[PDB]
Design a protein around this ligand. Sequence first.
Ligand SMILES: [Mn+2]
Ligand SMILES: [Mn+2]
Ligand SMILES: [Mn+2]
Ligand SMILES: [Mn+2]
Ligand SMILES: [Mn+2]
Ligand SMILES: [Mn+2]
Ligand SMILES: [Mn+2]
Ligand SMILES: [Mn+2]
Ligand SMILES: [Mn+2]
Length: 327
Amino acid sequence: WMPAYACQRPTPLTHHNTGLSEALEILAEAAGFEGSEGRLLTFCRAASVLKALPSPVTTLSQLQGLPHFGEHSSRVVQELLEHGVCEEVERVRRSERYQTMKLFTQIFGVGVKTADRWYREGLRTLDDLREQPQKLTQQQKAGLQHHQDLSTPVLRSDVDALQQVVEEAVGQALPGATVTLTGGFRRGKLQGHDVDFLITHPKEGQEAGLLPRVMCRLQDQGLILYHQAFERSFCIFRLPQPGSWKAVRVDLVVAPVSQFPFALLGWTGSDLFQRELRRFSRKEKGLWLNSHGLFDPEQKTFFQAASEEDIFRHLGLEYLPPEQRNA
DNA sequence: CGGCCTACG
DNA sequence: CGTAG
DNA sequence: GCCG
Ligand SMILES: [Mn+2]
Ligand SMILES: [Mn+2]
Ligand SMILES: [Mn+2]
Ligand SMILES: [Mn+2]
Ligand SMILES: [Mn+2]
Ligand SMILES: [Mn+2]
Ligand SMILES: [Mn+2]
Ligand SMILES: [Mn+2]
Ligand SMILES: [Mn+2]
């Protein structure tokens, strides 16, 4: 019944098994902190299966036959159903290691390997890092400086204001260029950790050199707190608010129009949906997918797509709109 | 046994 | 390494 | 951790 790849099934934003999926996602995050991407992926995939089910799981029997449920994930669910808590999950939650790794990796510019080195050196708080600025890259310094604002959910009103100023700068940089909201907001999320935008021009090649021109125009309007030929810019914007301002993470991506459906698909996510789609493409169809194209390595040709629908069709998949890609 | 997405900055 | 979805 |  339930397909094994997340790209083969609809996953809505609101689902019926949050308690169970949240517990499995804690274990997935902890697996990542200990350097096991494989265990992280299994726990994420198991959590995602539960998000696609039509009803609450109330009895362990309802897991039988589900993909990515084996002995470990099933026992977590059984303990949650039988007792309301999973001892392993609670032990991870309360551990100093998990809490500190979560704190550090949430900083823009810090991943697991950096966080783990700092943990091993005895560092535990954001003030600990601030007291040792020479150990920070420029990106990390920006992430730490703006950490409180970046921990505030981004709202739709923020998205709408940012889209206007990005459209203004893009139109000043290149007439006819377009701006498309991507990321979680395109999947219907009401909040986010950032705003993602994809920029193109209908005439192939006209977008060459665009992103530096857009960045210069935003900087001159005082809108940029942090950035840095390029085609992806992971920015922090100074977003005006009533009487003040707040820092907001914004990702700006430029693609030629030939690549636009592939970039739109990749940048709309979810992260797990796209990893699963790329895995499906290669392992089941023999085709190589990324945000630039879909390559047949035996004919040595790229699939020409005019839409996301075209890509799903070439992969033999039922089309899913963005709001059903919340894997 | 090994794979686990696949790029850019 | 970091970033992205 | 699960699976091809
Ligand atoms: Mn439902
Ligand atoms: Mn186990
Ligand atoms: Mn028990
Ligand atoms: Mn980080
Ligand atoms: Mn986003
Ligand atoms: Mn490129
Ligand atoms: Mn093995
Ligand atoms: Mn993301
Ligand atoms: Mn293992």
